[PDB]
Design a binder for this molecule. Structure first.
Ligand SMILES: [Mg+2]
Ligand SMILES: [Mg+2]
Ligand SMILES: [Mg+2]
Ligand SMILES: [Mg+2]
Ligand SMILES: [Mg+2]
Ligand SMILES: [Mg+2]
Ligand SMILES: [Mg+2]
Ligand SMILES: [Mg+2]
Ligand SMILES: [Mg+2]
Ligand SMILES: [Mg+2]
Ligand SMILES: [Mg+2]
Ligand SMILES: [Mg+2]
Ligand SMILES: [Mg+2]
Ligand SMILES: [Mg+2]
Ligand SMILES: [Mg+2]
Ligand SMILES: [Mg+2]
Ligand SMILES: [Mg+2]
Ligand SMILES: [Mg+2]
Ligand SMILES: [Mg+2]
Ligand SMILES: [Mg+2]
Ligand SMILES: [Mg+2]
Ligand SMILES: [Mg+2]
Ligand SMILES: [Mg+2]
Ligand SMILES: [Zn+2]
Lengths: 52, 146, 66, 239, 90, 81, 83, 101
RNA sequence: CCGGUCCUAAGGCGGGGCCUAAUAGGCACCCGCCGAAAGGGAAACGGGUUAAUAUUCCCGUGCCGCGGGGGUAGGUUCUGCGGCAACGCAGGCCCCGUCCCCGACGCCUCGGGAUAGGGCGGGCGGGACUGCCGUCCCGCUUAACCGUCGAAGGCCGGGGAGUGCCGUAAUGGCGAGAACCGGCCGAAGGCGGGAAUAGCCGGGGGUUUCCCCGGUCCGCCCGACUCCUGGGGCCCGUGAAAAGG
RNA sequence: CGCAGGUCGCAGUGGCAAGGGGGACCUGACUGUUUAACAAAAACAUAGGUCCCCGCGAGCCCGUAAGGGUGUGUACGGGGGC
């Protein structure tokens, strides 16, 4: 059931929406910050040295 | 445009009952508005077939037979029809309102009313005729009850 | 819309009516006063009906047959 | 992972926590109640172990108290030093006659009551030491302790006794009681586990554990925890 | 009777000199009789309806209301046709 | 505020039949602002304003003129007809 | 809208329109009537069915009105007379 | 008998509940005629059911069928015209459903 | 006037504070806010119209909140009037406070009342079939809103009952006040108004959707899974809060 | 719901719909849960029994700390084993 049938449950939910600050589809509507730029939990832009 | 889609909403019927006359094949391609479908419906080139209602002649014939007692034997029964709980409600109401009327008018004393009222609750009497027969036989009241 | 049964009470409403509508039947006539808020209707005998239309026309209230 | 269930309980996850929003409030003595009051309500509280009484004080303060047995709606109770030792009255431990049956005893004054708070439980006032302002009472476990004489207790025994006498006949009955409490229901035996999950889990014939010392660290402190003894002989040694 | 609450209100209103409220109470009294009687005839409970209509005749005499008399005459006419058709089929 | 007029088939039928002029305004213009702009710009009287935001992201306003003014007359006077 | 009609918070009423159709209207259930502050029973003269809030309900002509029933009021007055 | 002519009573039911009045007549066992003067206490002169009044411990001297002005002189003789002006204040918080069962 | 928007739930975020080498890390504390398009919660229904919107446009008939004007009851030191009572009735105006209630609540079970829907007989109109019979089918509708009525249940007054007496589907009830009599409060829903002028059926005239004519009925029956009401039982299970009123 | 009479077939709950039954041993009391994708079990849970740590400033657990869960609780209780 973990394959194709469970894929049909991904039609109506959402974890992220568009971030106002960076415009990416990375704003976590439950945690209330952006997973890309960190908006909502950090006023400084989130960027790490391990990522190119 | 689809004329049957427009015509069904004008006529207030399903699209499966809308009929376009084959003589009006030429005028179909010219129709643009619902006013053009209204012109054709007035001319009789678009109408609606009357809907089907299931005929009840066989049922109405069969229902008279069932009232006379046909087609209700053991081989035609598959589940419960008579309501055992519902029968008890009518049995108490018939016997209680009969006994209560008799005592209310005075033909049965409250003492003798009590024993019959409890006998009714105790399932002594099969039906109203049995109760009337008991009341007439034992002379529980001055004048016989019909 | 509201219904009133006493002609004395209905005359207070019908006199202020923008328009009085009339609907006629055999045994009665429906008089309907159209005010700004509500539509007041009374059912009166036919003989009473032509009488009520008469003064209402004398009160300059518009009377329109529906 | 590898952390055992008793270690996961301390994180305060939702399946280990008390649903205290289902109750109207704590059953505690307000610190500044005295005079006369009226029993206005007697209520069932989800998750609690006794019926709860609502008291409308004369001045107007309303508080919650565990209902003594025999307490009824519309009863008049006395609170304060000048109250008599009648059932349902709230008095200081100093003014209670010895040999009296009390419940909701305050260890120190003002904490709201700590001991004898379950249905059918009571505390017995054993003695008085007014020089040091302590009252010697026997707790429901049988332990004899000293409490502040200025502290407050209620007269009588807690209503609702015999509740645990009736069996929890089905697993479903204990399921519904668990949802108003904080217990995780149900519980898996340690030896039914794998060795990553419990110290007892593992072998082809799974076994329980011998007792662990009192100094054992968390994750190892399961089973018998520094127990004085075990089995029927431990019960005999206690007596 | 069914509309006795409206009768007492009219005499109380007139006693206190409230001509406006007495008229409003007079209208409510006629409404209580005609509406309840007209519903009974529609359900064809003529025995209940005629008891109300007989009471309405007394009230119009007791209060000088012609509109009760006009509306009661309409309801009695309907009762005649209902009873007439019942006799024909039965 | 006004961006342009709508002279489509639906908008023209509305002008002749319901005394309504259809306009495209700024997306942030409210009904109070649209009625004020129409009255000031053209010297007419507005009865009510019905507004919608189109699927392409514009705001469209159905302005119904009061009953002394011609919706088609204002269209033909402006020369946008 | 739609799942707000799949819940039983509103009343599903079927009605036949003058146009011949049958439609389902969703109406509110009535609000609870005022209760006495002692016994909790409904108060006479104020227990008619009301379906929206903000509607004035005229209390009975008595001291304390729609707060306590006549039984609680009369008995309390008796206690105050002796007290 | 407690409910007797010249007895101050507090009406407990109706619109005039809690107000003070004086019995001036006796209709029968079930009824008496009260009048604490309507200018004074707020009670009109009419019959009252004896179950709808609460007798007080204060009583005055007036004959049967006493007029309303007679009761006024009697109560001012007793200096009770101010007592007839107060209204009784109930304490509903002390009442429980056991009292009215 | 359909939803969001408002409220709070389980929860969450931010500031202050405390902690931290430090923060973009933690939160017991204080303060504020967010948190439901299925919970709570103001007020619109029927008809018509488009190629595509339709409780939104148009027609008709209304409702809610906020504010204003007139009239009226009332008030103008002071209190509204009636009834034994339950309670009824236009019940003055402005500001502030306190308290109470509504909001506000499970599961099972059985009585009662309705409505949607469905059927039978007759009538009128229209349609189906042509071996025989003459049957079969369709239309005959009535929204929100205003008024009146109100089953259960509760209550009031009289009455004063034990040889008892009054009952239920069932358990039952009574000097801790029954039978019995009279009254007050009180549903879904009914009926009238809306409203036949609409819509539908049938028969016609014109022409781009308009106009004319007739009918739109009589007597019954079943009846919900929809709506209302009450009785009984179960819980070591008790079945939210707040805005608002 | 019943009774009487007549009557046709191979067949009348005529299609549709719609239990094969019984004896005995092992085993888990039972309803319940389980290896999404080879295991549904005799495995897990269970009600019941019993033992241990604990009088609350407890016992056990989480956190670097501030502090937190059990706890709006109190031995007819919380936690931990079998
Ligand atoms: Mg998620
Ligand atoms: Mg057959
Ligand atoms: Mg049975
Ligand atoms: Mg839990
Ligand atoms: Mg294993
Ligand atoms: Mg080890
Ligand atoms: Mg290990
Ligand atoms: Mg091992
Ligand atoms: Mg909009
Ligand atoms: Mg909602
Ligand atoms: Mg609700
Ligand atoms: Mg919110
Ligand atoms: Mg569409
Ligand atoms: Mg027919
Ligand atoms: Mg039964
Ligand atoms: Mg088969
Ligand atoms: Mg098993
Ligand atoms: Mg199984
Ligand atoms: Mg598998
Ligand atoms: Mg398998
Ligand atoms: Mg096992
Ligand atoms: Mg065993
Ligand atoms: Mg062992
Ligand atoms: Zn971002």
């Amino acid at each position: 059931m973990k394959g194709t049938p469970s894929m049909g449950k991904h039609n109506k939910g959402k974890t992220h929406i568009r971030c106002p600050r960076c415009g990416r589809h990375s704003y976590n509507v439950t945690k209330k910050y952006c997973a890309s730029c960190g908006w909502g939990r950090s006023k400084r832009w989130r960027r790490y040295n391990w990522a190119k | 445009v689809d004329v049957k889609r427009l015509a069904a909403e004008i006529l207030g019927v399903g699209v499966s009952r809308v009929k376009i006359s084959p003589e009006a094949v030429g005028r179909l391609e010219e129709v643009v508005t619902k006013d053009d479908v209204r012109a054709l419906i007035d001319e009789g080139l678009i109408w609606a077939e009357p809907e089907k209602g299931n005929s009840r002649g066989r049922w109405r014939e069969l229902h008279e037979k069932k009232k006379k007692g046909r087609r209700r034997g053991q081989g035609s029964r598959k589940g419960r029809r008579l309501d055992e709980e519902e029968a008890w409600v009518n049995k108490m109401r018939v016997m209680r309102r009969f006994l209560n009327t008799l005592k209310r008018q005075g033909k049965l004393d409250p003492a003798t009313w009590r024993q019959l009222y409890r006998m009714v609750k105790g399932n002594y009497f099969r039906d109203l005729r049995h109760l009337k027969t008991y009341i007439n036989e034992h002379k529980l009241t001055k004048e016989p009850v019909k | 819309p509201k219904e009133i049964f006493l002609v004395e009470l209905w005359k207070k409403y019908g006199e202020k009516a923008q328009v009085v509508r009339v609907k006629r039947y055999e045994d009665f006539v429906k008089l309907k006063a159209r005010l700004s808020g509500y539509l007041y209707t009374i059912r009166v005998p036919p003989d009473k009906a032509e009488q009520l239309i008469s003064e209402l026309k004398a009160k300059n209230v518009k009377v329109e047959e529906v | 992972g590898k952390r055992i269930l008793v270690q996961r309980r301390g994180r305060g996850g939702s399946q280990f926590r008390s649903p205290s929003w289902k109750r109207d409030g704590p059953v505690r003595y307000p610190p500044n109640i005295s005079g006369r009051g009226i029993v206005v309500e007697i209520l069932h509280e989800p998750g609690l172990n006794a019926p709860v009484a609502k008291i409308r004080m004369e001045n107007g303060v309303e508080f919650f108290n565990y209902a003594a047995e025999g307490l009824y709606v519309g009863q008049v109770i006395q609170v304060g030093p000048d109250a008599p030792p009648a059932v349902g009255n709230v008095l200081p431990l100093g003014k209670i006659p010895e040999g009296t049956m009390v419940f909701n005893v305050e260890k120190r004054f003002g904490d709201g009551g700590k001991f004898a708070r379950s249905g059918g439980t009571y505390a017995l006032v054993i003695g008085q030491r007014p020089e040091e302002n302590k009252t010697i009472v026997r707790l429901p476990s049988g332990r004899v302790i000293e409490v502040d004489a200025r502290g407050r207790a209620t007269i009588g025994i807690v209503a609702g006794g015999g509740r645990v006498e009736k069996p929890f006949v089905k697993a479903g009955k204990k399921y519904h009681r668990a949802r108003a409490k904080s217990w995780k229901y149900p519980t898996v035996r340690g030896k039914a586990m794998s060795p990553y999950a419990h110290p007892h889990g593992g072998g082809s014939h799974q076994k329980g554990g011998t007792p662990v010392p009192k100094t054992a660290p968390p994750g190892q402190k399961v089973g018998f925890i520094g127990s004085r003894c075990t089995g029927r002989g431990c019960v005999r040694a206690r007596a | 009777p069914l509309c006795s609450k409206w009768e007492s209100l009219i005499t109380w209103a007139e006693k206190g000199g409230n001509s406006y409220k007495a008229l409003e109470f007079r209208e409510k009294l006629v409404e209580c009789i005609v509406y309840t009687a007209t519903e009974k005839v529609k359900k064809k409970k003529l025995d209940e309806a005629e008891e109300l209509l007989k009471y309405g005749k007394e009230v119009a005499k007791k209060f000088n209301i012609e509109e009760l008399n006009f509306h009661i005459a309409l309801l009695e006419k309907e009762i005649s046709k209902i009873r007439q058709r019942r006799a024909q089929a039965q | 505020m006004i961006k342009r007029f709508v002279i489509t088939e639906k908008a023209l039928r509305l002008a002749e039949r319901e005394n309504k002029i259809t306009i495209i305004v700024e997306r942030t213009a409210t009904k109070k602002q649209i009625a004020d702009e129409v009255q000031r710009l053209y010297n007419v009287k507005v009865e009510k304003v019905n507004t919608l935001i189109t699927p392409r992201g514009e705001k469209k306003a159905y302005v119904k003129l009061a009953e002394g003014y011609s919706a088609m007359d204002l269209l033909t006077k402006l020369g946008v007809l | 809208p739609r799942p707000a009609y799949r819940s039983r918070s509103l009343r599903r009423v079927k009605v036949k329109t003058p146009g011949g159709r049958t439609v389902v209207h969703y109406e509110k259930r009535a609000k609870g009537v005022p209760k006495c502050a002692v016994t909790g029973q409904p108060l006479g003269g104020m227990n008619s069915k009301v379906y929206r809030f903000g509607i004035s309900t005229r209390a009975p002509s008595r001291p304390y009105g729609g707060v306590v029933s006549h039984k609680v009021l009369a008995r309390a007055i008796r206690y105050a007379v002796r007290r | 008998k407690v409910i007797d002519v010249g007895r101050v009573v507090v009406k407990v039911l109706g619109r005039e509940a809690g107000r003070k009045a004086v019995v001036v007549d006796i209709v029968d066992e079930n009824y008496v005629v009260i009048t604490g003067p309507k200018s004074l206490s707020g009670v009109r002169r009419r019959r009252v059911n004896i179950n709808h009044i609460e007798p007080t411990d204060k009583k005055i001297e007036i004959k049967k069928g006493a007029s309303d002005e007679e009761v006024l002189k009697a109560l001012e003789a007793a200096g009770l015209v101010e007592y007839m002006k107060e209204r009784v204040k109930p304490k509903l918080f002390e009442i429980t459903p056991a009292d009215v069962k």
